[PDB]
Design a binder for this molecule. Sequence first.
Ligand code: AR6
Length: 501
Amino acid sequence: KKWLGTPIEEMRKMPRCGIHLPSLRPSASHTVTVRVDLLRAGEVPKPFPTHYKDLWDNKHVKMPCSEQNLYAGSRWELIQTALLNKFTRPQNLKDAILKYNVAYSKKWDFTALVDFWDKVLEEAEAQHLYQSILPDMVKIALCLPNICTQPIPLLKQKMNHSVTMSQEQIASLLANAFFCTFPRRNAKMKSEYSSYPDINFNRLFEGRSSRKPEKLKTLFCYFRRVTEKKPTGLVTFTRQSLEDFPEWERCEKPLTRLHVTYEGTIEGNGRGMLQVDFANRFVGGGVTGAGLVQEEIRFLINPELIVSRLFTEVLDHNECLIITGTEQYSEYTGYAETYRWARSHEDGSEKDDWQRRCTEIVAIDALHFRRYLDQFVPEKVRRELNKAYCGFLRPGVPSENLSAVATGNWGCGAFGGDARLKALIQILAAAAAERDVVYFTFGDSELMRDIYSMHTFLTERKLDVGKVYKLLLRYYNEECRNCPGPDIKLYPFIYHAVESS
Ligand SMILES: Nc1ncnc2c1ncn2[C@@H]1O[C@H](COP(=O)(O)OP(=O)(O)OC[C@H]2O[C@H](O)[C@H](O)[C@@H]2O)[C@@H](O)[C@H]1O
């Protein structure tokens, strides 16, 4: 038996369950970088305004094309002069990039880049990269000031704000990231941007990791498609931050429906559902660097997610980033050290009334546990409930229009968490948000069954979240607090504690 619970066909998914959308427009809480009066199916969006407007502030992105990006001396014009040379070898790209990054000439290794070029790529491919792709990338990179003509706000901690943007605009930005043109983004001592993730792609060219080329394949697949064929969709990046959370002890809301399976993945089989990304608080994690786990894979196969790093400040405990409309340009076999680029992916997902694809991804960072038992402390249980709930909550949205949540072993690989606790927590969080849950256990068939049995057990006995929470609190005190290893595990205890009275 490959799955358990309520069948996946009965779960709500977009666009079916979606609300009627209000007309897209700019507001104090919503930056829209395109012309909404023109927005139209299968036609590349027009940027608003028509001509570049610059801001060099602590409130907006610092664009490379700004007349205030200086090295007098226009670094932008330095960047143009550098990239407009012809690249016949890897070192020409190294030198080019290092022309406007002279402080890092002996700190940025480019060995991975040369290996992908000379060894892993065959001559017919290597030729295609420097004759078609690279010069095509440079054109869209230098078109930035004609395409990203509206300053881009930074999504800082505590801001509840959305930025909606064209896929074409995303492309030009990411192109700039590749060639490492974003100023004041590379220091260590750092100024402004210590609390923001890396955006420049320098670390992607470092060292002798065997995975490094496969990432380069994955991003070039994306850089190929959008250069050869411009995409026409919009993407929304929404930072959400709550100041008030459910009193979990006294919450009276019932548990929702579950579908659990050890077959499939969030991206593959959570189509048109709220797909959870298991983030680092610096969203995207080490996608640019040496990370190649769930989030980073997701950021690579949906490379438009990466740009979020340009403007999304590290998430606080009460925050998440919702991304709606990113497109999948690659497929993958493997995981981490076994990850391979396998195939260009043709996405056939329906776009909504704002021309965003009906893919909604939410980044929520679990906590990272040194030790096992630390997670059962109420504080930590409460934190994770709050993070997930924020992840799932759509304030002012009727539940009958919320899709189900496609999630899995959140926090339970790199971050040391317990799958059986975190499953339950997300089940508690989703119930508070009145959403249904589709759980992917990622091969673990015993976990599928334990979560099923648990959910099934709790539903029978008509326990509201408050009662299921109070049990988790009871587990800590009676069995975790005074513990050489806790005597009974979480699930056997709940079965005992419920049946014992
Ligand atoms: N495509 C998938 N679909 C469903 N489930 C998956 C998938 N991929 C992995 N899993 C399961 O989900 C588990 C998650 O293990 P993890 O990917 O490490 O996320 P974390 O919260 O533990 O740690 C995230 C950190 O690592 C990153 O660098 C971030 O930036 C953070 O810094 C796997 O063991 C799988 O069972």
